[PDB]
Amino acid sequence: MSIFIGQLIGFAVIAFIIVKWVVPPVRTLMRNQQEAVRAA
Amino acid sequence: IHVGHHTLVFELFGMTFNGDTILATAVTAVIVIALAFYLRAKVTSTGVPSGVQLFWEALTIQMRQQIEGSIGMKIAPFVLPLSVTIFVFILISNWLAVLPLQYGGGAAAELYKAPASDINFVLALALFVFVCYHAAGIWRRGIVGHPIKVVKGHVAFLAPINIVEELAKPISLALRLFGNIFAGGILVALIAMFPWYIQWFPNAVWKTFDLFVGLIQAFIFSLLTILYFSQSME
Amino acid sequence: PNAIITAGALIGGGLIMGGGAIGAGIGDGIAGNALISGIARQPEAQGRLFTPFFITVGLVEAAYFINLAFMALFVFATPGL
Amino acid sequence: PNAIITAGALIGGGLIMGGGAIGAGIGDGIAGNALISGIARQPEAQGRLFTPFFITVGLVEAAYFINLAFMALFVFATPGL
Amino acid sequence: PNAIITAGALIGGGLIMGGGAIGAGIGDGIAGNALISGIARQPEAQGRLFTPFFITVGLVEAAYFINLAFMALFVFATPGL
Amino acid sequence: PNAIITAGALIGGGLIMGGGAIGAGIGDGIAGNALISGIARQPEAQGRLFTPFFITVGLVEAAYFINLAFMALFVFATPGL
Amino acid sequence: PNAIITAGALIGGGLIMGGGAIGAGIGDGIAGNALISGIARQPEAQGRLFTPFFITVGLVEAAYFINLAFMALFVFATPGL
Amino acid sequence: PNAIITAGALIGGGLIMGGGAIGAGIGDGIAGNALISGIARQPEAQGRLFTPFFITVGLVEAAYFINLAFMALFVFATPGL
Amino acid sequence: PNAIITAGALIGGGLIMGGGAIGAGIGDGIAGNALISGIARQPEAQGRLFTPFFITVGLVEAAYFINLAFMALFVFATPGL
Amino acid sequence: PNAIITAGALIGGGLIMGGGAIGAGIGDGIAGNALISGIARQPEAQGRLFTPFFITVGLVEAAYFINLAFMALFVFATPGL
Amino acid sequence: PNAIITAGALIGGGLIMGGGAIGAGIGDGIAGNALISGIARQPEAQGRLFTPFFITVGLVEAAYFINLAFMALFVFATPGL
Amino acid sequence: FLIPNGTFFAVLIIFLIVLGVISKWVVPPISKVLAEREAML
Ligand SMILES: COc1cc([C@](O)(CCN(C)C)[C@@H](c2cc3cc(Br)ccc3nc2OC)c2cc(OC)nc(OC)c2OC)cc(OC)n1
Ligand SMILES: COc1cc([C@](O)(CCN(C)C)[C@@H](c2cc3cc(Br)ccc3nc2OC)c2cc(OC)nc(OC)c2OC)cc(OC)n1
Ligand SMILES: COc1cc([C@](O)(CCN(C)C)[C@@H](c2cc3cc(Br)ccc3nc2OC)c2cc(OC)nc(OC)c2OC)cc(OC)n1
Ligand SMILES: COc1cc([C@](O)(CCN(C)C)[C@@H](c2cc3cc(Br)ccc3nc2OC)c2cc(OC)nc(OC)c2OC)cc(OC)n1
Ligand SMILES: COc1cc([C@](O)(CCN(C)C)[C@@H](c2cc3cc(Br)ccc3nc2OC)c2cc(OC)nc(OC)c2OC)cc(OC)n1
Ligand SMILES: COc1cc([C@](O)(CCN(C)C)[C@@H](c2cc3cc(Br)ccc3nc2OC)c2cc(OC)nc(OC)c2OC)cc(OC)n1
Ligand SMILES: COc1cc([C@](O)(CCN(C)C)[C@@H](c2cc3cc(Br)ccc3nc2OC)c2cc(OC)nc(OC)c2OC)cc(OC)n1
């Protein structure tokens, strides 16, 4: 029970970190690739 | 910390199977199959690629570039699928452990344990790669020619060293993947010994960095597979 | 009798991880020093330097993680007991 | 019996942390030496040099963390206790 | 019983300080070597060369501090005592 | 008496694996530092540099696993047991 | 008795001094290598280079003194005695 | 009586191979760094550079071999049994 | 009771001088590498290279000397004996 | 009595050879690194470079040899036994 | 009682020799690397280079010798016996 | 825990399936897409 709550708080922290600092760059990359593809 | 004790263990064909590891491998396989099928349905040469199309394109381009720079794609067309499937399999296996699929017994149990944490999974991948590039070397050199080149290597008078390095290629390639993920399975367990109000911090940081660690391990395993193929084919 | 074997296994595993950590840290530092020097001299080389880098790292990490695995064998499944 | 195992675990954890400190410190020093040399050579590359740096620091500091965990296993949760 | 645990804890703390001192000294020496070489090559870089330095030192001084902490736990609060 | 034998064998195997880890990791890091630097300077030299590199690593790895082969002989065979 | 504790404290303090000596010697030798190279490549910069030098030697020689402050604690005070 | 003798022999042989592994791995890595750097800087020099290399690795790998041999004497023919 | 403390003090002094000799040798070698390379590159500055050299050596030889002194204190004036 | 002294002598000789092998291997690696770099840069220097190299190796292997001798003295003519 | 002190003295002397051998080998290798590089790039400079080199080797071989002395004091003239 | 088990095969089989699927569902279509990409420019 307690282990699940602690790990879930940790996973919320991980999700927040990736969404705030990891998701933005690898979203750009994807958007830049799509823009380049539609360019040609 | 109760290392080992694979759950769902059963027996069939007169041999024992770790049920939990098989379940994790099947979950990873179905995720990879879903990605492949969603690509196949939505693969566009002329349209704007989807997210899965971009992911697969980037991975395939990276592996194809590695093959081009190590051993010509004409010589090794069969190694690109191997590298791509290896990379995705290990990456998904490692990253599925980031999901909060663990709970408390009163020891900590984990619904999804990364399959690489089991010796069988990493040993199977390493031995499959071993047999694959040794067969490739046999095909490109001959049944008798290939062992001679393998033993000789690049320096003849270092014949035993080669014979060790060769046997070191699978072992390391397995254990390097084993200990990296196996170790993680212990840390998450160790961090589980903390109370919930301070457990999240070490767990959070460890798994945030374990995302990158698993990505790097999948990349390294695939890269070394390609390198061993380039070595053993010429 | 089991206490002495357990203590010896703990000391051996501590030695294994100490050596593995020393090797991993120093070798990874040296490889990353090469990587950073290369990216400083040729900032456009970064993309091509991750292949020979993660190869090197891949080698170095092995010496660590193999050791790590064996420590578990020393610690949780002591060969003698 | 418990005293011997606890003393062996303390010595093993001391080895773990000594090796981890040596590896982490020396690897961080080498990677930061590369970073300092690069930023001396190419100040405009400062930011571009922080990507290969934190990766290298990420590789060593990961190992250290693992070490710091395993010592915590040896010292507080002596496996062979 | 407590005598064996205390002796083992003292040996472990000695190992922790030995490793921490080796790592801290050598890593600080390497980072300072980079800093001194950079300042020698060009004076105006000094102002920037202290940002990567104090970062690297911060990584190398953290490890030592961590070890500095754990010996304080080993000897003054010997776990398992 | 076999308890002392097993404890000594475990400590000796831990020393073997720690030394092997240190040597293998640091030597692989040095060789890969050379490889990464050479590829950074001359990318076209990549394929040329892997021939000597994998000779040198081939030796370094052979120092590791041979030691590992002996550690097994210490812990699983334990000569003199 | 505490004779075992005293022997363990002596071994621990010996480890502390050994690691501190290794770290201090090697790190300040590296810093001095940088200083000598900088003065050789630019003999007019001697005084300049003494600012960063004594900083890193300040970090390298601090680690020694701290270790010197703890070996004395180990053998003269022996906190666990 | 023999138990302690052969336990000490096991620890000593482990030390012998730990030192041999460290020396062999690091020396081979350094010689390989030299060889790779020479081949990268002088592509046509490879055939030449293997004579200085195997001499170096000859002296390095020789030491390891001796250590290995002596471990056998320590381990399978332990003196003073 | 005094025999155990004496053996521990002998081991501790051995560790003290082992670390001191390692640090002294390696640091003196590094400083001498700097000096020799600078004299080769800038022979006219031979004198100006000796002030930063004897300083560095002066630090290294200090670290050794202190250790030696304490080794005496360990072996001849064993604290807690 | 005899068994304890023999085990201690075996451990001491193992330490002697481990340190000797570390020093010999790493010193040979460094000297051969210089030799390989010089021969790669200066072909005709191959003849002239083997005189300093043989001196350096002479100073390195000698240490190893000395250690070897003393290790024999420890294990075949154990003093104080 | 004399057996315990003799075993401890043997271990301590082995530690002294291991540290002295490591330091001597590595420092001699580093100094000889400097000498070899200087004589490779400055063929006619070797004469001058032999002045600092023998100074460096003087400080290195000195430390070894001192260690070689005290190990004898540990082994033949055990202070604590 | 380092001793292999039957799961070995149970893993290998599964991996082979993926190796098969990616061998035809993924790699050839992606190579075709990249070839068309090169052709159109
Ligand atoms: C006093 O400060 C610290 C710092 C640490 C570190 O371990 C670094 C120590 N090192 C530099 C010697 C550190 C860390 C952990 C990493 C783990 C992985 Br996997 C990969 C990279 C890492 N990089 C890291 O720093 C770059 C760390 C650990 C942690 O544990 C709960 N929480 C953190 O908060 C986010 C944390 O960052 C501050 C630990 C610690 O405890 C004793 N005290
Ligand atoms: C299975 O492979 C090996 C290889 C070795 C070596 O020791 C090298 C180990 N290293 C790379 C870490 C190896 C060796 C010995 C040398 C001796 C001198 Br003097 C000088 C140079 C040497 N270089 C060497 O390889 C570069 C060796 C040993 C040996 O033992 C009877 N027979 C040999 O010839 C048949 C032999 O050569 C191939 C040992 C070993 O033991 C398990 N297994
Ligand atoms: C002589 O004085 C000291 C100094 C220390 C240090 O550890 C550095 C020692 N080193 C140079 C070998 C030091 C320190 C800690 C750091 C921690 C992290 Br994370 C990252 C960088 C650090 N950098 C640091 O100095 C650059 C430190 C530790 C501490 O502990 C409660 N309190 C401090 O007051 C804020 C403190 O700063 C003065 C310890 C000590 O104890 C005996 N005595
Ligand atoms: C190849 O097998 C060997 C080699 C040795 C050496 O030690 C070198 C080992 N090393 C490379 C790790 C070697 C030696 C000794 C030196 C002594 C001084 Br002082 C200065 C330079 C030296 N250089 C040396 O070689 C460069 C040596 C020692 C010796 O003693 C009985 N007899 C010799 O003649 C036959 C002899 O030359 C071959 C020892 C040995 O014994 C187990 N087996
Ligand atoms: C056989 O000769 C020696 C030499 C030493 C030294 O330690 C050098 C050790 N090295 C070579 C590793 C040496 C020394 C000490 C220094 C101390 C400081 Br702080 C700063 C610089 C130093 N530089 C030093 O050499 C340049 C030394 C020590 C000492 O002790 C009372 N008396 C000395 O005066 C005669 C003395 O020579 C100035 C020790 C020794 O003991 C057996 N035997
Ligand atoms: C030979 O004489 C010495 C010198 C020391 C030093 O530690 C340096 C030793 N090293 C060179 C190996 C030294 C020192 C301390 C420093 C502390 C910090 Br934080 C930061 C930089 C330091 N730099 C230092 O020298 C560069 C020191 C320590 C101290 O404590 C009692 N009192 C001192 O003044 C009387 C003192 O001289 C300033 C110790 C010692 O032990 C018996 N004997
Ligand atoms: C060659 O056989 C040797 C050599 C030594 C040396 O230590 C070198 C050790 N090395 C090779 C690891 C050596 C020595 C001592 C020095 C002392 C100082 Br302070 C400063 C510089 C020194 N340089 C030295 O050589 C460069 C030495 C010591 C000594 O004492 C009995 N007698 C010697 O004359 C016979 C002697 O040769 C001049 C020791 C030894 O012991 C078995 N056997």
Side-chain angles (χ1 to χ4, degrees), chain A residues 2-30 32-34 36-40, chain B residues 1-10 12-36 38-112 114-148 150-234, chain C residues 1-43 45-81, chain D residues 1-43 45-47 49-81, chain E, chain F residues 1-41 43 45-81, chain G residues 1-43 45-81, chain H residues 1-43 45-81, chain I residues 1-43 45-81, chain J residues 1-41 43 45-81, chain K residues 1-41 43 45-81, chain L:
Chain A
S2 63
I3 285 159
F4 180 86
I5 301 299
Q7 87 183 42
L8 187 63
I9 300 155
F11 173 71
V13 171
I14 298 158
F16 169 76
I17 285 164
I18 61 186
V19 165
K20 193 162 190 297
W21 291 289
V22 184
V23 162
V26 189
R27 226 228 213 87
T28 70
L29 278 71
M30 296 213 171
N32 289 5
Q33 183 62 255
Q34 289 182 320
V37 165
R38 73 160 39 72
Chain B
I1 200 64
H2 190 75
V3 169
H5 206 164
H6 296 98
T7 192
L8 278 73
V9 163
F10 60 88
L12 269 184
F13 281 42
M15 66 217 291
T16 307
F17 295 82
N18 308 346
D20 67 337
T21 298
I22 291 162
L23 182 64
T25 311
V27 165
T28 301
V30 298
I31 301 299
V32 169
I33 289 297
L35 289 174
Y38 182 76
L39 168 80
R40 182 176 180 273
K42 299 214 202 162
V43 64
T44 64
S45 301
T46 52
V48 188
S50 55
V52 307
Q53 179 159 338
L54 284 195
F55 162 74
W56 286 115
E57 266 173 14
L59 175 51
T60 301
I61 291 159
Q62 179 57 224
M63 297 302 165
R64 185 166 52 64
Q65 263 157 42
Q66 293 307 334
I67 296 150
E68 287 290 332
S70 61
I71 188 68
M73 197 84 198
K74 300 289 94 175
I75 301 101
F78 51 78
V79 67
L80 169 59
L82 185 59
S83 312
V84 170
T85 188
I86 286 168
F87 182 89
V88 299
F89 211 56
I90 294 167
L91 182 78
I92 300 298
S93 279
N94 300 346
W95 278 6
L96 279 167
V98 178
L99 302 171
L101 275 284
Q102 154 190 5
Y103 56 103
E110 184 178 1
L111 294 172
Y112 174 91
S117 68
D118 180 288
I119 189 65
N120 301 285
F121 172 96
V122 302
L123 189 62
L125 261 68
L127 291 187
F128 182 74
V129 164
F130 167 93
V131 170
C132 284
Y133 65 87
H134 274 304
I138 279 161
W139 160 71
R140 188 146 155 83
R141 299 169 170 170
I143 187 63
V144 67
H146 167 76
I148 287 168
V150 169
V151 169
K152 283 169 69 78
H154 291 254
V155 189
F157 67 83
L158 291 172
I161 297 89
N162 308 329
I163 296 160
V164 170
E165 191 199 342
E166 298 300 314
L167 300 176
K169 289 186 187 297
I171 292 168
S172 66
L173 197 74
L175 287 170
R176 167 168 43 220
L177 187 67
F178 177 64
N180 197 315
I181 294 89
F182 170 85
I186 290 180
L187 282 72
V188 300
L190 270 161
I191 290 159
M193 310 205 64
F194 281 125
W196 66 263
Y197 38 82
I198 190 167
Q199 165 177 353
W200 62 267
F201 188 51
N203 178 277
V205 59
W206 161 242
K207 294 209 301 191
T208 299
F209 281 103
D210 213 5
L211 280 157
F212 301 95
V213 163
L215 170 65
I216 285 156
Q217 286 313 120
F219 182 54
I220 282 164
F221 187 81
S222 295
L223 211 67
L224 292 177
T225 288
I226 290 161
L227 207 42
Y228 296 165
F229 266 96
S230 68
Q231 291 201 264
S232 79
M233 293 182 286
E234 196 68 89
Chain C
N2 279 282
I4 297 89
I5 298 172
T6 297
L10 281 156
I11 292 163
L15 286 156
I16 290 164
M17 269 283 273
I22 290 163
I26 299 179
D28 284 318
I30 297 160
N33 170 294
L35 177 75
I36 301 154
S37 305
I39 291 159
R41 182 177 173 79
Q42 176 54 255
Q46 179 174 356
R48 65 160 182 268
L49 293 182
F50 282 130
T51 290
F53 172 71
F54 286 119
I55 281 161
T56 295
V57 169
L59 299 158
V60 171
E61 298 297 331
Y64 182 42
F65 288 119
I66 291 153
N67 269 279
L68 199 150
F70 282 108
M71 182 179 72
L73 187 68
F74 272 40
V75 169
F76 311 108
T78 318
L81 213 61
Chain D
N2 188 358
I4 288 165
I5 295 159
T6 310
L10 279 149
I11 292 159
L15 285 153
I16 287 164
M17 294 299 291
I22 290 165
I26 295 174
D28 291 331
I30 297 158
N33 171 1
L35 180 76
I36 297 152
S37 304
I39 286 161
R41 190 187 203 277
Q42 282 207 354
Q46 187 157 7
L49 290 169
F50 274 108
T51 301
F53 177 73
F54 288 129
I55 292 162
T56 303
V57 165
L59 287 165
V60 310
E61 297 298 326
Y64 185 95
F65 192 93
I66 295 160
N67 276 75
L68 188 153
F70 271 104
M71 176 275 292
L73 169 83
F74 281 41
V75 174
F76 308 109
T78 308
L81 183 63
Chain E
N2 273 9
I4 301 299
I5 303 170
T6 304
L10 282 154
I11 296 160
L15 274 151
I16 292 161
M17 294 298 102
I22 293 160
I26 299 181
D28 283 333
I30 297 162
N33 166 295
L35 170 75
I36 299 153
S37 302
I39 289 161
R41 261 69 176 169
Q42 70 276 17
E44 80 294 332
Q46 177 168 330
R48 65 166 184 273
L49 290 190
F50 272 104
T51 300
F53 181 66
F54 293 138
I55 281 166
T56 306
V57 175
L59 285 159
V60 176
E61 289 306 297
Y64 185 93
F65 182 63
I66 298 161
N67 281 41
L68 183 63
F70 277 108
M71 182 179 72
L73 183 85
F74 273 40
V75 307
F76 307 117
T78 305
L81 196 72
Chain F
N2 296 115
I4 296 98
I5 301 299
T6 295
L10 289 156
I11 294 157
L15 284 153
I16 290 171
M17 274 316 275
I22 292 158
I26 301 179
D28 280 341
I30 295 160
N33 166 295
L35 177 80
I36 299 155
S37 304
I39 282 162
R41 285 175 170 70
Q46 186 158 352
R48 183 173 82 247
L49 299 199
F50 278 108
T51 295
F53 169 81
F54 272 114
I55 286 162
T56 72
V57 162
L59 286 156
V60 172
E61 294 293 328
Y64 183 89
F65 282 96
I66 289 169
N67 274 282
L68 169 51
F70 282 113
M71 183 278 288
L73 189 144
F74 272 37
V75 302
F76 306 117
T78 307
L81 183 63
Chain G
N2 59 12
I4 297 89
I5 299 174
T6 305
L10 286 158
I11 290 160
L15 282 152
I16 296 196
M17 294 298 102
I22 289 161
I26 296 181
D28 70 48
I30 295 159
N33 176 88
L35 175 77
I36 301 151
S37 301
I39 279 158
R41 179 145 209 271
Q42 174 57 21
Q46 174 167 314
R48 172 169 64 140
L49 301 176
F50 272 113
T51 303
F53 176 76
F54 280 128
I55 285 170
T56 176
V57 160
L59 288 159
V60 171
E61 298 296 321
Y64 191 97
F65 172 87
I66 298 163
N67 291 113
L68 182 62
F70 282 116
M71 181 274 289
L73 183 63
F74 272 43
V75 299
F76 304 123
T78 314
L81 212 58
Chain H
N2 281 282
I4 300 97
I5 288 162
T6 176
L10 279 155
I11 286 169
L15 281 154
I16 292 164
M17 294 299 291
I22 295 162
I26 286 162
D28 284 342
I30 295 159
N33 171 291
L35 174 79
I36 302 154
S37 300
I39 286 164
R41 284 152 199 170
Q42 274 291 124
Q46 87 285 341
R48 187 177 47 201
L49 299 186
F50 279 101
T51 300
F53 175 76
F54 286 124
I55 282 163
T56 303
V57 166
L59 277 298
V60 161
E61 282 287 341
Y64 180 96
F65 181 68
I66 294 163
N67 281 54
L68 188 153
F70 274 115
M71 182 179 72
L73 193 149
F74 272 43
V75 170
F76 306 117
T78 180
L81 202 43
Chain I
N2 279 9
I4 297 89
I5 299 177
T6 287
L10 284 152
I11 294 159
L15 284 148
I16 292 158
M17 293 178 70
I22 289 160
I26 293 170
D28 289 352
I30 294 159
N33 187 358
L35 181 79
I36 301 152
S37 74
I39 280 164
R41 187 262 186 192
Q42 183 93 75
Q46 177 151 5
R48 292 180 181 177
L49 267 75
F50 274 113
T51 300
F53 176 73
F54 293 125
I55 281 164
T56 301
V57 172
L59 293 166
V60 164
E61 295 314 277
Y64 188 92
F65 172 75
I66 296 145
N67 287 112
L68 175 70
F70 280 113
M71 175 280 299
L73 179 76
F74 271 45
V75 298
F76 312 119
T78 305
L81 182 60
Chain J
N2 188 358
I4 300 287
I5 295 158
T6 313
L10 289 154
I11 291 167
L15 281 154
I16 292 165
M17 284 271 297
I22 289 160
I26 301 182
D28 296 332
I30 296 163
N33 187 358
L35 173 76
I36 297 152
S37 301
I39 284 167
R41 292 183 291 113
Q46 184 147 16
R48 179 185 56 270
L49 290 166
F50 269 113
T51 289
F53 175 76
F54 285 163
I55 288 158
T56 307
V57 162
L59 285 166
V60 167
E61 313 293 343
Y64 186 87
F65 181 75
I66 297 155
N67 285 261
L68 202 170
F70 280 121
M71 183 278 288
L73 179 89
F74 274 41
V75 302
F76 301 118
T78 301
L81 181 64
Chain K
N2 290 318
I4 301 299
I5 295 165
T6 303
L10 280 155
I11 298 159
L15 290 168
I16 295 169
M17 294 298 102
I22 294 162
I26 301 178
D28 294 336
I30 294 161
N33 166 294
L35 178 77
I36 296 154
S37 301
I39 295 173
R41 76 185 67 268
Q46 63 195 274
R48 91 197 71 169
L49 297 190
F50 272 106
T51 286
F53 172 75
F54 286 134
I55 287 162
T56 303
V57 161
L59 290 154
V60 175
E61 294 293 328
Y64 187 100
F65 173 72
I66 298 155
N67 276 46
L68 188 153
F70 271 104
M71 182 278 288
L73 179 84
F74 277 39
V75 172
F76 310 112
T78 311
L81 272 190
Chain L
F1 61 84
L2 286 180
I3 300 299
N5 220 354
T7 289
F8 168 91
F9 301 107
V11 164
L12 185 66
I13 287 191
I14 287 168
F15 172 76
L16 285 167
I17 290 161
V18 185
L19 174 59
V21 162
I22 283 169
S23 161
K24 61 190 293 298
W25 288 8
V26 170
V27 177
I30 290 285
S31 172
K32 183 178 184 293
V33 167
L34 299 169
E36 298 296 331
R37 183 66 59 84
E38 281 275 35
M40 65 179 288
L41 62 87

